[PDB]
Amino acid sequence: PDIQVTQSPASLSASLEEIVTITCQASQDIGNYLSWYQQKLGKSPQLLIHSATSLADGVPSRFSGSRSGTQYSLKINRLQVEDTGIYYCLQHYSTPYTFGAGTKLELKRADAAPTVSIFPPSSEQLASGGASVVCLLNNFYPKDISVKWKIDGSERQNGVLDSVTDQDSKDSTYSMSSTLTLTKAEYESHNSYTCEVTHKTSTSPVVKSFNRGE
Amino acid sequence: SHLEQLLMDLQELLSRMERMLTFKFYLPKQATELKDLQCLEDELGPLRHVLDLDAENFISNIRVTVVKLKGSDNTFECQFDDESATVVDFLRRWIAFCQSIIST
């Protein structure tokens, strides 16, 4: 009878100095054989609390664990900017061991306007017959944002690839990269390229633009 | 009858125990009440691994006895000493605790 474990919440955003509680529920009496782990940027997990209630060696003292029967709690006593990331529980009572599915914790912040940069295709890429137009939106908050590419005034949806960074561990902002990829011939058939940024920090969309050959 | 069953089960374990002496067990500083048996339950993991030549039934039934004895009202947090003990001294210690807590 494999031991199942439910973790909750799946995700959460909380402010600085906030008390955060993360729960794991075990399908059986597991006693003190559950531990808590932290993972940032998809890198190595780190043990936080072991045996339900004991702080591990080099872990901030704001982390603590409690247990009530089959309910287990990870508590962060007053959240720090660096605490953004993912938290996991693990039953290690008997084989097979089982991880909770994780909690994605993000930090709330005051608003921050993106710094917007647009980049024409490099002459090195055009030589290869390709043309990637790049727009970078850096250090903004909140995470929600929308980007549109306009070519000579009309929106282009095809050839666009978007990517957003995980929350920054030092200033809680996000960054985004939008690349519009065209063939050199296609790129040379138009004149004006615009990256249009919609974000709550501006009433009207922020525009960065260039004219091909300017 | 639960205690004396645990005592004999712990006496059984010590008697048939004495490589596996490298495993490090840990004890509470003070063990004077039934709710302190939580600290024994917490070490059954490693106690199971050393138990090598279906002994699972032995540890499992010790655990149910401990759960019947430690109480149901509260989840007592155990406070362990940092000093480790072999599987032998650990077993002798809890045996002594059982004899200690029976005669009161």
Next chain:
Amino acid sequence: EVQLQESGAELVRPGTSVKLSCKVSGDTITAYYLHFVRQRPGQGLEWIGRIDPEDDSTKYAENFKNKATFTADASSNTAYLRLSSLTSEDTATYFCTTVTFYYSRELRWFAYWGQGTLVTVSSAETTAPSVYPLAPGTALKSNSMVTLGCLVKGYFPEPVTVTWNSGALSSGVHTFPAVLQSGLYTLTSSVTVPSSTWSSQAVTCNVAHPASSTKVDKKIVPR
């Protein structure tokens, strides 16, 4: 006190197998149970199983019963995971971690983890990236800040690493997650430096793609 390091083929074909290594240093391997854990790209940790190098005894998750085989070589301080009948679902980062009762309580439960190593299961062949400069196309007006970048386009599989000035630029760096289109990955990496730092000294991105044995250094120059 101890380090774990995973390694293995980065690209493997479907239906074939892969053998992953977990090299432990800092201590003997006999003191540990070696557990393997995998993480799918957007997903959580998933317990695969374990082996005890002393006993060679093995424990397996249900989903990996017919898929995984743990071995160990005590002489080389290394445990191994062979994953068979590989599908695209096996595409993941694989970690090793430990259990021990030879030390303190705080060191028993997955106290040590490897850095983790990525395995891609695909029919596609390895492809080297092209690295293009990202330079401001309007004039550089001093006393401001400036954002520079490198576009790393059309490689396979993941991962690639990007540093700036070989690590000397660490702050103001954003390396974005790769995006897959038509079987090829593309990622951008930016660095923000004072406008006066650009003119006085070199700003260069160092790009590596081990899967194709590619190292590229691209100096970013004004346009």
